[PDB]
Every structure is written in C-alpha cells, then in structure tokens.
Amino acid sequence: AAKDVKFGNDARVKMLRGVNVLADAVKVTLGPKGRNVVLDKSFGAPTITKDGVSVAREIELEDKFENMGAQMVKEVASKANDAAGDGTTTATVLAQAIITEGLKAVAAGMNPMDLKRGIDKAVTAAVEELKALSVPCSDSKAIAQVGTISANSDETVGKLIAEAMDKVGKEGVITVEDGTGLQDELDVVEGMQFDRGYLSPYFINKPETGAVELESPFILLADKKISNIREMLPVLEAVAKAGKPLLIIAEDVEGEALATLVVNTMRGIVKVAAVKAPGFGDRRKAMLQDIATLTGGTVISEEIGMELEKATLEDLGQAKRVVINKDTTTIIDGVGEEAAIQGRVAQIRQQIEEATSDYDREKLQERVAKLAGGVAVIKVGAATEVEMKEKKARVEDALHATRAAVEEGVVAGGGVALIRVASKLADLRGQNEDQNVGIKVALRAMEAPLRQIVLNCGEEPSVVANTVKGGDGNYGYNAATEEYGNMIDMGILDPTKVTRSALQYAASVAGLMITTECMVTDL
C-alpha cells in the first residue's frame, strides 16, 4: 500500500499526541484516588477496570502516526504486565514523562541518541539505587500491606493473600477464580502447578487473559507419543461422549494432524487442550504418575504395554478446574482419592528419605513441596459480573505484587522510591552534554508517578512533590489520607520488582521513541 511519510517535528508531535492519548487514558487510573475506565466489548457488556494495561491494550487511534505512538507506548504496559503483573499505569506514566521531556530536548536541538544513552545510564543507576533501597518483605513482613496497596486500598484482599501465603507458603501456588457468593473466599485444595504452556495460540478461551479455564475437565496422561492418529480415535470418541474437557499433559503435542483437524471437527463446543510435561526422562514419568495419582488416572507406557485403545474414561483422571497459561498451567482440584494422595505423599517422603544425590534430592523436595502445600484458591465475591471482573483484576494485581515483593523486596510506595533514587542520582553525568540532559530527563520523569498520584487526588502535584523531595528516606505522602509520613509505617509499600520493571520498560521504549526522525505508515 502507498505510504504516508512524515519527518522530524511533525512526526514527533503526532507521535507524542498518540502517546498522550494512550497515557491520559491509562493515567486516570493511577493511585488510590485513581478512577475507572470503561472499555467497550462488542461481545457483551463493557468492562470497568482500573488496570493500566487493559486500558492501554484497548487504545487504538484513527490517525496512523498517533496510532504508531500509541502502540509504541502500549508496549510499555504490555511488558510491565507480562513481567511483574503490576505497575503498568506507573510504567505508562514514566514512559510518557520520558517521551515528553526527551521530545522537548530534541526540539532544543540535541542529539536524541545521546539522550537515549543518558536515559539508559540514569535508569541503570536508578535500578542499582532501587536494589540498594529495597527492603526484604520477609524482614518487614508486610505481604498483607503490599496486597492491600496493590488491590486499591482493599484490606480484605491483602489479608486474604497474606493468609493464602501463610497456608501454602510464600512460594506456594495461588489462583484467583470467579466466586459464587458476594464475599471473597479462600480454600486450600489439592492441585498441581507446572511452568508449561499451550502449543497453539488458537486454544485460547473467550477471555483475553491468555489462560483458558476448564470447568471440571478430564485429565489424560501419557509419557510416550504414539505416531498414529487412529489409535487415539477411541480415546477421543470416549471423551466426546463424555462431557468433561480434555486436558492432555503428555510429552509435547503438535497441531499438524491433531489440533487442525479438530478445528474442522467442532465449532468450539467443548475446548480440548494439550500441553508439554516439565522435565524429561524418569523425572517426567515420576511427575506424570504423581498427576495420575492425584486425579485417579493412569499413565500409559511402552514398558507397561497398556495401549490407549484399551483405556477407558474411568481409568483416566478427572479434575474440577484447570487453568492453562503460557507461563504456568495449574490444576486447581483433581479429586482422585484422598487416601491415595496421602499414601503417595508418604511414599515420596520415604523416597526423599532414601535419596541422597543433590539434584534428585532437590527435585524430590520440589515434589513434596508441591504435594504438601497444595494450591490456594481465592473465589472472588461480587454481586454482578462487571464487579466480578474489576475485583478479580484487583486481586490478580495484588497476588502479582505480593509475589514480586517476596521475590525482590519492597520500597516506599506512592512514587517515593523513584523520588529518592532520582535524588540520589543528582550527580550522575554522561559522556557529553546531551547525555547529561538525557540523565536529567530520566530523573525528572522519575517524579511523574508521584505527581500523577497527587493529581488524581485533585491536590497540587508540585507542592507535594517538593515536600516529598525535601524529606528523606521513606518519607512521603499518603494520598488516601492526604497527609505525609513514613510510607513504610503507613503501609504504602511497592514491590521493588514492580518499580524497577516499570522504570526499565518505560525507559527502553521511551528512549527509543525519542530518537525517531521519520515515521512511515499507510495512507
């Protein structure tokens, strides 16, 4: 197609207009006084959300150059959501601030590559200062506070996440699902969790979360992969006459002759998904046997000789809920037999008593941790479906932030940590003047989250920013109560990973964005 080509300042102002549209839409949601955004879905009711990445993902502009700017800066929130699950609004605000100040510097006639290098140096130094400024969440013991802050000042959600991490361990697996009542419920049930994903992007359910949910699925287990398709036809026919979705945890499946011909088979009545199995060799068969014992199923094998044609539905496993995601697939509740589960736990405990080699010992301890800890499940309570989606998003953000806090630590929330690390970087210099100006651009942009948090409250961002910069340490401004204090003491804690990731992704995209002289799009 014929291309529209824009050069220099006209292109940059159109790109900034697109970034400004996306970033305003995202930034109205920042902080405790941040408001909600309604996203239109032609497939049903609109979704009300405070999540920055959802608003960012929905944004697309009519103007092609402004749309290019919007997609460029939407990458920031996408990466922030994918890496930490929180801070997408903060990442978008930081990216917009860097883009605005860097374009102001480019309009002042300075080299944007050196501006990008200065921004990169300042952000590397600020990541180091964030690591130094971080406080371990085990020492502080504020998992509930992190979850409360990340759930938009919801003490119930944070306390529930803290209880779940107390039940299954801070390294345990917690899954959020839609509840049935109007109140949030937590149950510690028996289920598995593996870092495995689907082999086909067309297996995604109607939700756009990327993780398909199965209502009482049917588990199929096989450590070997038979070449012929026709031998699998009796099993597929038995599952089709059954009414539980088929999840296959076998040793990697292709869509050349199974998923494609199934796409032409049904129109999407009941979803069937297959995923890999973590590990290999004896370890893979061991965990496959563990899954089969959990769900009451069996594992076929060449040595056993039990062929899939002779397998029945009663021989196969059964579960109550399975969430399949690219990052991690979890089995929420496989019934099986509780006595069988306890016996397998005792047998694997005897195995770890017998085992002595370090790798086998550590994988066996991972197995016993997965079996004993189980899975915590949070059923979100909400009177309606729109409230359900909003609260579930908040609970998922709280879970991600608590995970990031136990993984990497915490810093002062409310944008105070970025203010402190920018104050600590006031003497950082580059190789020339443009690099120094890029450093100053990054350091000024580090104040943007706090300023936007204050602006959402209706207060004056500059006065509060100056008052916070005057203070030292964890001194900042509770926007919920509109008063200053030690942000750790008042429980406004950000994950260190969330802040670091937001800063890094905003910096990378925005520093690349300020270096553009020409933009080429369609007409």
Next chain:
Amino acid sequence: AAKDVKFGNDARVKMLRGVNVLADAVKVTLGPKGRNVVLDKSFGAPTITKDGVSVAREIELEDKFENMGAQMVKEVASKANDAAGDGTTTATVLAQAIITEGLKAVAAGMNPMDLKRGIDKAVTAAVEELKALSVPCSDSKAIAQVGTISANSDETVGKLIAEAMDKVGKEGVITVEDGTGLQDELDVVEGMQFDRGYLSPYFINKPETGAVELESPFILLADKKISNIREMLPVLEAVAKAGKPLLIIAEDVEGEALATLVVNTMRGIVKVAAVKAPGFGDRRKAMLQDIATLTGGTVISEEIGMELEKATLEDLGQAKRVVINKDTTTIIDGVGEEAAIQGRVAQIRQQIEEATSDYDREKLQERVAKLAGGVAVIKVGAATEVEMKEKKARVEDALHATRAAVEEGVVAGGGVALIRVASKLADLRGQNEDQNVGIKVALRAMEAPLRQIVLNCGEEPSVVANTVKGGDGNYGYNAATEEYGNMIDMGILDPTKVTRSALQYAASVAGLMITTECMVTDL
C-alpha cells in the same frame, strides 16, 4: 478498530444519557399503574410486556458511549432476573437513582471511589435491615397475596399459584406454559425436576427464554459412557424414525463429535437435546431408574449388558412435555404406567423404612418428595398470542416472587421497605465525607422505587414519599387504590429476596459506574 476516547464529565453525561434512556424505558412499567412496552421482533409479532428485564434487554443505542452506559445498567436487570426472577424494574430504578445522585456528587468534586465505598456500606447495612425487617411468609400466609402483587394485581394468578403450592408443597415444582382455552388452569401431573442444564448453548429453541420446550419428546436413558458413535447410531436412527424429539439423560456429554455432528446433520427441523445427571454412582443409577419407570423406559448399564444396539422404541421412555433450562430441567408429563409409578413409590417408601444412614435417608426422602409431590403445571389462558406472552410473563413473575417469599420472607411492598430501612440507616457514617455522601446517595436512591410507583400513577411522588416517611412500620401507600394504610393488611407484599437482590445488584453496578473517568469505545 480506531477508538473514541472520552474523559471526565463529557463521558459521564453520555453514560448518564444512555442509562437514562434504558431506565426510562424500563421505569414506565413499574407498579400497579405502570404501563406496557412494545418490543419489536423482526420475527413474528411484537412483544407487549410489563417486565423490566425484557425492555432492558431490548435496549441498544446508536451513540456508543450512551450504549455502553445502557449495557452496564442493563446488567442490573439481567442479574435481578437471573437471581430472583422479579424486581428487575425496581433494580433498574434503584441503579438509575444511584447513578444520577453519584454523578451529581462526582460533579461536586467528591472522590468517586470513596462514594462507591459509602454506597456499598449503606447497602450492606440496608440488606441487614431488610433481613431484620423481613416477616416469614409461613407466619403471614400470604403466598396468594405475593403472587397477586407480582402478577400486577391479578388475584386469579396469585390464587392459582397458592393452590399449586398447596397441592405440590411450597418446595414443590411448578411450571408455567401456554394453555389452549381463554382461562388459566392448574394441573397436578406426574413429572420430575432436577437442577441440571443443557451442555450446549446452541440447543436453545427460537424462544429467547433460554429454556427449550419439547412437544411430546422421546426419553433416552444411559448410565455407562460408551465410546463409539456407530454403536449408538442405530439408536439415533430409531429416534429419527420414531417421530418424537430426543432427550438424552446421561452423566456428561461433550460436543466435538455429537453436537457439531448433529448441527451439521439437519437444518433445525426437530430438536435433540441432552442433559446432565445430578449425583453420581448409586444415586445416579437410582434417579435414572426412577425416570425410566416414570416414562416406561429402561436404563443401560455395563453390568446389565443392555446394549444400545438392541434397544427398541417401546423399550425407551416417552414423555408429553419437557422443559430444559440451565438452572433446572423438568419433565412435565411422562406417561409410563400409573400402576408402575405407584409400585415404584411403594418400593422407595420401603427403602425409606429400611435405610438408616443420614445422607441416604435425606436423598431418599428427597426422591419420595419429588415422586409424591409431582409437578404443578399452569396453563395460561389467553385469546391471542401477544396476550399469552404477556400473561405468561406475569405468571412467571408471580411464581418467582412466591418462591422467593417462601424462601426468604416478605416485607412491605410499594417501595415501603426500602423507605423504612433508609430511615433506619439515617445515622450510618463512613470513614470520610465522601463515604458519608455516598451513604446519603444510596439512602436517597432507596426512595426511588416508591417515587416511581407514585409517578406512574400520575400523583406527586414527593408528597407520597414524605407521607410514607412520616409513618412507621408497614405504613405505606396503596397505589392501586390511591390511599394510605398498612401495606401488609392491604396485601401489598414484596419478597425480601427480591428487594434485597434488586438493591444489591443496582448498588454494585451503579457504584462501579460512578467511578468512571475515561470511556473507550469504537468510532
């Protein structure tokens, strides 16, 4: 697609405009003096209805932001219809009042999230006050009055519902369907009822009620889960030559090889449906045997060896009417043999006498209650099809309200109960001024049902609202007779569940709606 993005007050007034359009169209139907709405159907005659959820579901607007507001506020009536089957107009009126007053508060600079928190606190307290204010319907014995009020002051419908609850029990199963004469008839007929639904959303008939109906279907029973189709294909041919539509009762059926195959089979001449079987193991076998004995059919099993290829038409069961709904599937009339039904009842009563375990005793007495009570069927009498649909909707509302009244209790109707709980909540306070204003918004919005009822009468809502607020207890205003008095004495009784659910759903959706600052839709 390119997105239109609106911010702040412009977005909020567009959203309020859409909510106002939907809520006006719904609110014209509120109360005894409420009028009817004609909904256009491209297929067949238009539908005249006084039901709030039908008018709400038909609403869709040209403006995308107004349509988005309409969809969110339509979720209120959808949830109210799904949860109680009544009060959708009251729920819409409450939601519109909360949205209006909350948007007025947001225009006054008040924090909308704390306004939502205040509304939530006030509505939780009001639900507690409604539970306290509730009077049991067994003590009052006004099931006929509840049905009469819920059928728009139709004494005959309420008396018919009361007679049905007297015949089959207040826990008995009552189904409403089209009659043949001009008068409404009650028939206590033998039939079954289970809390199970269709496994495919594509089995829905041309009516949009969600519950398909079968005109003299053919009942098929199966317990063992066979694999192949070609062994069951002769049964499909036998039913497809027998002439009556097929209803299969089994544990669980997918749609990869059956539902899509049956979709590709015919163009929609005769419907074939399958349903789930509640319980498992011996209990499922027991209920399948009961269904087979009721319809004269037989249940296949692996132990019996009654292979489906040998099954004939006389061996299978037959019924006169079956209603398949997601919440509950009922068999209105299975002929079978009356002597066989009585013998099975005597045998299961002997099982009652023999059994001693609490779970077996309770499930077996549930079985004998289902068998002895039977199904009450209400033949709606109307001279035309449009009157048939309107009266059937009114009788369905009456049935739902009587069920809610026996389940949860009754309160003073005409919006009096919400007025009383608002008066009782006058001293409720929140954490800050925003939360207090949200509480006051909810309390003023709880006067809206009574005011709309009065406005539909052509009277002055403020005068009647003040007069009712002056009174105490069940003192309210009969809008049918346009005079004040004790609401319980005049028989104006609302279900407690209906009022509580309407308030809760209106509050949740409206409080979420008032917190929106940006709105994103298509162009």
Next chain:
Amino acid sequence: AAKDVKFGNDARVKMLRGVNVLADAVKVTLGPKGRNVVLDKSFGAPTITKDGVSVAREIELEDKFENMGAQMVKEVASKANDAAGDGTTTATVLAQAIITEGLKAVAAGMNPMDLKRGIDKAVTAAVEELKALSVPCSDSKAIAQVGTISANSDETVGKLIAEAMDKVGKEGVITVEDGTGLQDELDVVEGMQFDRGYLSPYFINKPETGAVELESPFILLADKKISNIREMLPVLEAVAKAGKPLLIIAEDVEGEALATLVVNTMRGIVKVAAVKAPGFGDRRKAMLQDIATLTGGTVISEEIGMELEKATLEDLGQAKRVVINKDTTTIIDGVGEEAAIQGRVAQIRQQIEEATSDYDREKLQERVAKLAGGVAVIKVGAATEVEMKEKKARVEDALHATRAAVEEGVVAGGGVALIRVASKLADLRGQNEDQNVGIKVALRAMEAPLRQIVLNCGEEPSVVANTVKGGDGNYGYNAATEEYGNMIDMGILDPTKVTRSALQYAASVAGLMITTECMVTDL
C-alpha cells in the same frame, strides 16, 4: 431573528469556553515573562501588543454563546483600561478565576446569587484591606519604579516618566506621542489641558484609541454661540484656505446643521473639530482669554463687538499639536509669543495677589498651575512602526500606573498584595454556606494573578504561591530574576488603584456571570 436558547450547564460550559478563549489570549501577556500577541488588522500591518485590553477587544468567537461569554469578560478589561489604564490582564485573570471557581460551585448545586453576594462581600472587604495595605507613593518615592514595572521592566521609560513628573509636577499633564528618532525624548513645552471631550462620536480619527490628534491645528475661540452658522462661512473659507485643522473652543455645539453639513461637505481629507469649555460665566471668558494668549488668538464677545466676519486667520490662534479625548482635551504647543505668555502669567499672579474669595482663589491657583507647569511630551523612539506602537502602549501604561500611584498609593506587585489581602480575609463569613463558598471563591481567585505570572515564567505556580503565602508583608517573588524577597525593596510596586479596580471590575462581571441559567442568542 430566530433565537437559540440554551439552559443551565450547557449554556454555562459554552460561556466558560468563550471566557477561557479570551482569557487565555489575554493571560499569555501577564508579568515580566509574559509574551506578545499579534492582532491582525486589515487596515494595515498587524499590531504586536502586550496590553491585555487590546487582545481582549480583538477577541470575537464564531460560537454565539462562547461569543457572549467572551464579550462579557471583555467588559472587564474595557472597564479596567477606562478606569486606571493598567491592570487589564490582571482584571481578566481575576475574572476568569472567579468565573471558573464560581461555575464549579454552581455545578456543586449551590445558589449562584448567594455566591455572587459572597464574592461581593469578599471583594468589598478586600478593597478595604487594599486601602489599609497601601503605602503612599510620596512617602515611598518610587514613581520611576512604578513606571518601570508598568512598562514591562523598562528602566528608561520609568525614569523618563519620573523626570516628567519632577519637571511639570506629579499633578502635571504628560502626553505620549510618536517620536522621530530611535530613542525616547522628554520635552517640557507650554501647553494647556481641560477636562472636556469631543461632542460627536463620528470625529474619531484613523487610530481607534478614542483620542484624535491634530498636526499643527488652527485654534478658534468663541465665548458666545451665534445663531446661524452662515455668519462664519467666510471664516470657514478662510480656514479652508490654510491647511491647519480647525479646533473650536466654545461653550457647546450641536451637530444638526454644523457637523452633519460638514460631513456632507468633506470626505475625510482634513478634520475640523470642536470642544466644550469648562466652567461658565467669567471663568469661561478667563480661560478662553488664557487660551487665546497662548495661541496668539482672540476671543469673540458681544461686549467687545468683534464680529467673526471681520476676524482674519492672523487674528485667530494656532497650535502645533492638539489631542482631543473624551476625558481630557490637551493643547501641546500653542503657537504664541513667549513674552505675552509671561506677561499674562504675571498679570494672573497679581490677580491672586488681589483676589480673596476662596473659590476664585482656588480656581486662580488652578490657572497658574496649568500655565506654569506646562505639558511634558514623551516622544517614543523606535526603529519601526510596530515597535513604535508596542513601546507607545507600554509608555502609556507606565504613565497611567504612575498617575494611579501618585493618586491612590502603591502595594506589593506581582499579585502579592491580593495574596496578602486574601490571607487577611480568611475569617470572613457570609449569611449562609453559599455566601461563604462565594467568599472562598473570591479569595482563591485573588491568588490567580501571581500564579499566572509564575506560569508565564515557566515555573510552578503552586509552589511559588505557597511560598509567598507562607511569607508576610511585602514578601513575594521577583519573577524577572526568579527569586524571592521584599518586593517593595526589589522595586516591584503596583498602583493601589490598579489592583483595586482590577479586583472590583473582575468581581462585578464574574459574579454576575456565574448567576446565569439561560443564554439567548441568534442561530
């Protein structure tokens, strides 16, 4: 014509949009860091100006309701220019701030008439506090500083105005006119001034300043008004021979048979003007004789018997420059014998030495002061005509501000005085809550000039406003040097009359404007 009629919030937001357009255009010119505005003139080159009233007068919008808002706010700058000649930008900024905050209060549901009453009470108390806070310019002796501040930090203009006030007296008459060189010159020249204006609105010359200028005019004097204009037709032809514009100083002249016939005669080549004579009886004859002795002319009278037909051009007087304005008509250099002027001055001095009546003595002191002081003419030096107009506007503003300072006093500039009076009015209360909110609206708007000055500097207005409010007395913010200090010491002095007038006119118009509910215009 058919009328468009808007009601309530739609009309108010249209009004506010028009106000915002006009006020943004005016407010870009506020302070020492304020920029210029180009006003397009079809009749020649565009005008570059920093004067708020010129930008305000040029503004007219396509939208009719926005145009009404713009016109009503433009009234503020027009009144401020007419009353003090300075502070029009400050008046516009104050009016816009009052309108914005008052419309916010009106949108909060408050009675706008009570808001207007509160604003009026706050502004009355504030002008009382400004009178209390005022420091006499005689005690301070900072006329040069006031002129420098009012000329946009031009030391030369302020020094020239101070020298002119030192030469002809602070009550003396100073006129600004276009020079011929590139530098500003001060000339003390024998001339008169009277508090009289032109009798016809059609006498305005090509400049739209409202004051016409005459290049070497011809002065005619007349104490009595003859019946027919045809007697002076020989004098009219004698004037029409010599190309000097005719300025007639008489008691009073109509335009039925003199102005209209001369407009029917002349097409706009050379202007003939007339003025009124202050005083009556002997005083008018005395001042006419004084003017005649200045210009070397003669005064006609009935007792003298000197008829205009016998009068010649040499008998009549003439001048070098005459400026005719509605408020005051000035004669710059009447062409007459200096020795005759000195002899007349001595004779009049002997007249005070003889007279004893208080009214006669005071009018004779006025006469000798007018004669001896003379007129101080400032020739503005600029390389081009656009720079000439800009500098002449700045010098006129400086002259007006110095006159206002010697009349009413000075206060701290930079919006500091309004900040101090708003701080001193923090305990002012009205008759109800809406009046208190109006008072608070006025007090918040009193911060607007300083905030707009700082925003024009590119700094943060909130931080500087808070820092100034923290200080006491004349402590404020030198915006030229970007640093705080005592602004009386730093030389940033505002006239008390200028600040008081700006506040009063902004308050009157804006308080009336917030009370609108319907707007009626054309289609």
